[PDB]
Amino acid sequence: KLKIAAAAEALTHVKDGMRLGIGTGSTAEEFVRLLADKVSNGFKIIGVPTSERTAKLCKELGVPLTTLDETPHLDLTVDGADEVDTNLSLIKGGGGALLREKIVAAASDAMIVIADSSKVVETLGRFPLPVEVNRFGLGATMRAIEEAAAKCGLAGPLALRLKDGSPFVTDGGHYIVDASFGRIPDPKTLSDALFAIPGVVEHGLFIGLARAAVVAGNDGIRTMNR
Amino acid sequence: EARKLKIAAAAEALTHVKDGMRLGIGTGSTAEEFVRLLADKVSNGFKIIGVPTSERTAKLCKELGVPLTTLDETPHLDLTVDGADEVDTNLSLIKGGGGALLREKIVAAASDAMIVIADSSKVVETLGRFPLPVEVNRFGLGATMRAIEEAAAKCGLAGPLALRLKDGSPFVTDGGHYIVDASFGRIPDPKTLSDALFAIPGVVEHGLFIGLARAAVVAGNDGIRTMNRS
């Protein structure tokens, strides 16, 4: 649809010979398809996958693959997001790949986001914030998340994420708690508060990582910048 | 030896353990001696319920008839008692030489108070001579290694990073993670370093305990001393 043109605009930021971090979800898959077309004309690139599902896609379509162990620093990560605010702070992890996405993006010189107009918000937080937790001590970690929220002036339900009947286990062996805070006006402070909890592994706030964002508007395609 | 000093500290810390409080039970050689002293007390009708910080702490406690519970079942505790690899005058710690730092920090942070018990060799002027354990995700190990070096550099630190091994392959934490032992030598600002390490998406947790321990019972041959908080 327009989803395609948004990915295609992001692929213009990709240079010959780049070391690339590749996102997960509906939008990054399309970026994979279009970049596969380009290699298939002698465009050279090497990619780190942020999930098994992206990894499979790259191999079926001929996008060369590497690892952060073999390729510890990347030029660019391209990935989707659940919410983008005007500081280009994001909420990510609706797809359950939040940690590998943070690690890959944090290992990169720059991160480009691809989203539609509906994901761009005045204030982050209507999308529930995914928080990745250890299964040991979940009860005390839930308490601490509510107290961490209270101290930052927020509140809302914390819902242990399920798949089928059971808790969702991430690629890395953790549970996810989706925190519905409604409005997160100071992401950095909340991120600090959540990190001070030992049970917290990581969370879906991507702060200061996206240098630019391609948005599929109702009018057409637009890029936001830093 | 070292052993009888760890016992005297354990016994002075149990002076703080009251009938029926719910306890965080540490792990390692010094917490072992505290468990026995609690067990000898249990069999004469002492009342307590304890959350284990490790796989092996739980087995000792069950072998001795110490009532055991869960943080899912018992999410807030009264008191955690545990060892430490380093204690400084502010009661900031380095922990995780025995590999249980994550569960230990979770347990201690869920407690109204945390008391440390150690022998006098564990008391330091400045944290950092004991290499700092950092618990890391297996995914992206290479990028996480780099970021730890970049964080150290911004805090004016340096040293080897060794992926911790056991029997020839990486030590796997109870929680499914690796440990990178960071030999920084001297850590004059623990708080700044702790923030810089948390900022790494690969870092799960680390062995700096800042502001958690309310007191530290220390043995030594110049007698038993409880360190306190300025």
CSV table of N, CA and C in Angstrom, one decimal, chain A residues 48-50 68-69 72-73 99-100 102-104 106-107 134-141 143 172-174 195-202, chain B residues 51-53 71-72 75-76 102-103 105-107 109-110 137-144 146 175-177 198-205:
chain,number,residue,atom,x,y,z
A,48,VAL,N,22.3,-7.9,10.5
A,48,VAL,CA,22.1,-8.5,11.8
A,48,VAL,C,20.6,-8.6,12.0
A,49,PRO,N,20.0,-9.8,12.2
A,49,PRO,CA,18.6,-10.0,12.4
A,49,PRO,C,18.2,-9.8,13.9
A,50,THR,N,17.1,-9.1,14.1
A,50,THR,CA,16.6,-8.9,15.5
A,50,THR,C,15.7,-9.9,15.9
A,68,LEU,N,26.2,-10.1,15.7
A,68,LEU,CA,26.9,-9.0,16.5
A,68,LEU,C,28.2,-9.6,17.0
A,69,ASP,N,28.4,-10.9,17.2
A,69,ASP,CA,29.7,-11.4,17.6
A,69,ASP,C,30.7,-11.2,16.5
A,72,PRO,N,30.4,-6.5,15.5
A,72,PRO,CA,29.9,-5.9,16.7
A,72,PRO,C,29.5,-4.5,16.6
A,73,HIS,N,29.8,-3.8,15.5
A,73,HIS,CA,29.4,-2.4,15.3
A,73,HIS,C,28.7,-2.3,13.9
A,99,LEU,N,14.2,-6.7,23.1
A,99,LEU,CA,15.5,-6.7,23.6
A,99,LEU,C,16.5,-6.7,22.4
A,100,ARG,N,16.4,-7.7,21.6
A,100,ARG,CA,17.3,-7.8,20.4
A,100,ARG,C,17.2,-6.5,19.6
A,102,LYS,N,16.7,-3.5,20.8
A,102,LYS,CA,17.5,-2.5,21.5
A,102,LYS,C,19.0,-2.7,21.3
A,103,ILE,N,19.4,-4.0,21.5
A,103,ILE,CA,20.8,-4.3,21.4
A,103,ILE,C,21.4,-4.0,20.0
A,104,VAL,N,20.6,-4.4,19.0
A,104,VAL,CA,21.1,-4.1,17.6
A,104,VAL,C,21.1,-2.6,17.3
A,106,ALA,N,21.3,-0.2,19.6
A,106,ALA,CA,22.3,0.5,20.4
A,106,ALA,C,23.7,0.2,19.9
A,107,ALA,N,23.9,-0.9,19.1
A,107,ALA,CA,25.2,-1.2,18.5
A,107,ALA,C,25.5,-0.4,17.2
A,134,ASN,N,12.7,-10.8,34.5
A,134,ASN,CA,13.1,-12.2,34.8
A,134,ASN,C,11.9,-12.9,35.5
A,135,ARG,N,11.8,-14.2,35.2
A,135,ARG,CA,10.7,-15.0,35.9
A,135,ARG,C,11.0,-15.2,37.4
A,136,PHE,N,12.2,-15.2,37.8
A,136,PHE,CA,12.4,-15.2,39.3
A,136,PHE,C,12.0,-13.9,39.9
A,137,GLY,N,11.2,-13.9,40.9
A,137,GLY,CA,10.7,-12.8,41.7
A,137,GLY,C,9.8,-11.9,41.0
A,138,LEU,N,9.0,-12.4,40.0
A,138,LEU,CA,8.0,-11.6,39.3
A,138,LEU,C,7.1,-10.8,40.2
A,139,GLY,N,6.6,-11.4,41.3
A,139,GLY,CA,5.7,-10.7,42.2
A,139,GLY,C,6.3,-9.4,42.8
A,140,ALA,N,7.5,-9.5,43.3
A,140,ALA,CA,8.2,-8.3,43.8
A,140,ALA,C,8.5,-7.3,42.7
A,141,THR,N,8.8,-7.8,41.5
A,141,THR,CA,9.0,-6.9,40.4
A,141,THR,C,7.8,-6.1,40.0
A,143,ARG,N,5.3,-5.2,42.1
A,143,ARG,CA,5.2,-4.2,43.1
A,143,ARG,C,6.1,-3.0,42.8
A,172,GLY,N,15.1,-14.4,24.6
A,172,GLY,CA,16.1,-14.5,25.7
A,172,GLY,C,15.6,-15.0,27.0
A,173,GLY,N,14.5,-15.6,27.1
A,173,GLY,CA,14.0,-16.3,28.3
A,173,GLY,C,13.3,-15.5,29.4
A,174,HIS,N,12.7,-14.4,29.0
A,174,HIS,CA,12.1,-13.5,30.0
A,174,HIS,C,10.6,-13.4,29.8
A,195,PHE,N,15.0,0.8,35.4
A,195,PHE,CA,16.3,0.2,35.5
A,195,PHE,C,16.7,0.0,37.0
A,196,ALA,N,16.3,0.9,37.9
A,196,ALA,CA,16.7,0.7,39.3
A,196,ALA,C,16.1,-0.5,39.9
A,197,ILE,N,15.1,-1.1,39.3
A,197,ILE,CA,14.5,-2.4,39.7
A,197,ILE,C,15.4,-3.5,39.2
A,198,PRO,N,15.9,-4.3,40.1
A,198,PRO,CA,16.8,-5.5,39.7
A,198,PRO,C,16.1,-6.5,38.8
A,199,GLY,N,14.8,-6.7,39.0
A,199,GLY,CA,14.0,-7.6,38.2
A,199,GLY,C,13.9,-7.2,36.8
A,200,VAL,N,14.0,-5.9,36.5
A,200,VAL,CA,13.8,-5.4,35.2
A,200,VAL,C,15.0,-5.7,34.3
A,201,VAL,N,14.8,-6.3,33.2
A,201,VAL,CA,15.8,-6.6,32.2
A,201,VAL,C,16.0,-5.5,31.3
A,202,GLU,N,14.9,-5.0,30.7
A,202,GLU,CA,14.9,-3.9,29.8
A,202,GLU,C,13.4,-3.6,29.5
B,51,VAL,N,13.2,-16.9,51.5
B,51,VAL,CA,13.3,-17.0,50.1
B,51,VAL,C,14.8,-17.2,49.7
B,52,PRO,N,15.0,-18.2,48.9
B,52,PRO,CA,16.4,-18.5,48.5
B,52,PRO,C,16.9,-17.7,47.3
B,53,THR,N,18.2,-17.3,47.4
B,53,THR,CA,18.8,-16.5,46.3
B,53,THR,C,19.5,-17.4,45.3
B,71,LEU,N,9.1,-15.4,46.0
B,71,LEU,CA,8.7,-14.0,45.9
B,71,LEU,C,7.4,-13.9,45.1
B,72,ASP,N,7.0,-14.8,44.3
B,72,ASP,CA,5.6,-14.9,43.7
B,72,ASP,C,4.6,-15.1,44.8
B,75,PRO,N,5.9,-11.7,48.3
B,75,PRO,CA,6.6,-10.7,47.4
B,75,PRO,C,7.4,-9.6,48.2
B,76,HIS,N,7.1,-9.4,49.5
B,76,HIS,CA,7.9,-8.5,50.3
B,76,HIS,C,8.4,-9.2,51.5
B,102,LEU,N,22.0,-11.5,40.5
B,102,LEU,CA,20.8,-11.0,40.1
B,102,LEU,C,19.7,-11.4,41.1
B,103,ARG,N,19.5,-12.7,41.4
B,103,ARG,CA,18.6,-13.1,42.4
B,103,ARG,C,18.9,-12.4,43.8
B,105,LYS,N,20.2,-9.4,44.2
B,105,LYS,CA,19.7,-8.0,44.2
B,105,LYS,C,18.2,-7.9,44.2
B,106,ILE,N,17.5,-8.8,43.5
B,106,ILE,CA,16.1,-8.9,43.5
B,106,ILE,C,15.6,-9.1,44.9
B,107,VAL,N,16.1,-10.1,45.6
B,107,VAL,CA,15.7,-10.4,46.9
B,107,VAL,C,15.9,-9.2,47.9
B,109,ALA,N,16.4,-6.0,47.3
B,109,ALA,CA,15.6,-4.9,46.9
B,109,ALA,C,14.2,-5.0,47.4
B,110,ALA,N,13.7,-6.3,47.5
B,110,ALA,CA,12.3,-6.5,48.0
B,110,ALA,C,12.3,-6.6,49.5
B,137,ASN,N,23.1,-10.5,28.6
B,137,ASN,CA,22.3,-11.4,27.8
B,137,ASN,C,23.2,-12.1,26.8
B,138,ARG,N,22.8,-13.4,26.4
B,138,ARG,CA,23.7,-14.0,25.4
B,138,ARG,C,23.6,-13.4,24.1
B,139,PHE,N,22.4,-12.9,23.7
B,139,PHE,CA,22.3,-12.3,22.4
B,139,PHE,C,23.1,-11.0,22.3
B,140,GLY,N,23.9,-10.9,21.2
B,140,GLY,CA,24.7,-9.7,21.0
B,140,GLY,C,25.9,-9.5,21.9
B,141,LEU,N,26.4,-10.6,22.4
B,141,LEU,CA,27.5,-10.6,23.4
B,141,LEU,C,28.7,-9.7,22.9
B,142,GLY,N,29.0,-9.7,21.6
B,142,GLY,CA,30.1,-8.9,21.1
B,142,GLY,C,29.8,-7.4,21.3
B,143,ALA,N,28.6,-7.0,20.9
B,143,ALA,CA,28.2,-5.5,21.0
B,143,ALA,C,28.1,-5.1,22.5
B,144,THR,N,27.7,-6.0,23.4
B,144,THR,CA,27.6,-5.7,24.8
B,144,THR,C,29.0,-5.6,25.4
B,146,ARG,N,31.7,-4.4,23.8
B,146,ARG,CA,32.1,-3.1,23.4
B,146,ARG,C,31.5,-2.0,24.2
B,175,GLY,N,19.4,-17.4,36.1
B,175,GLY,CA,18.4,-16.7,35.3
B,175,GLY,C,18.6,-16.8,33.8
B,176,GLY,N,19.6,-17.6,33.4
B,176,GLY,CA,19.8,-17.8,32.0
B,176,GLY,C,20.8,-16.9,31.3
B,177,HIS,N,21.7,-16.2,32.1
B,177,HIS,CA,22.5,-15.1,31.5
B,177,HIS,C,24.0,-15.5,31.7
B,198,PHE,N,23.8,0.3,33.1
B,198,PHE,CA,22.3,0.1,32.8
B,198,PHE,C,22.0,0.6,31.4
B,199,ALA,N,22.6,1.6,30.9
B,199,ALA,CA,22.3,2.2,29.6
B,199,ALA,C,22.6,1.2,28.5
B,200,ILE,N,23.3,0.2,28.8
B,200,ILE,CA,23.6,-0.8,27.7
B,200,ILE,C,22.5,-1.8,27.6
B,201,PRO,N,21.8,-1.9,26.5
B,201,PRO,CA,20.6,-2.8,26.4
B,201,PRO,C,21.0,-4.3,26.7
B,202,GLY,N,22.3,-4.7,26.4
B,202,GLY,CA,22.8,-6.0,26.7
B,202,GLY,C,22.9,-6.3,28.2
B,203,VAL,N,23.1,-5.3,29.0
B,203,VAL,CA,23.3,-5.5,30.5
B,203,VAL,C,22.0,-5.8,31.2
B,204,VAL,N,21.9,-6.9,31.9
B,204,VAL,CA,20.7,-7.3,32.7
B,204,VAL,C,20.8,-6.7,34.1
B,205,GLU,N,22.0,-6.8,34.7
B,205,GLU,CA,22.2,-6.3,36.0
B,205,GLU,C,23.8,-6.4,36.3
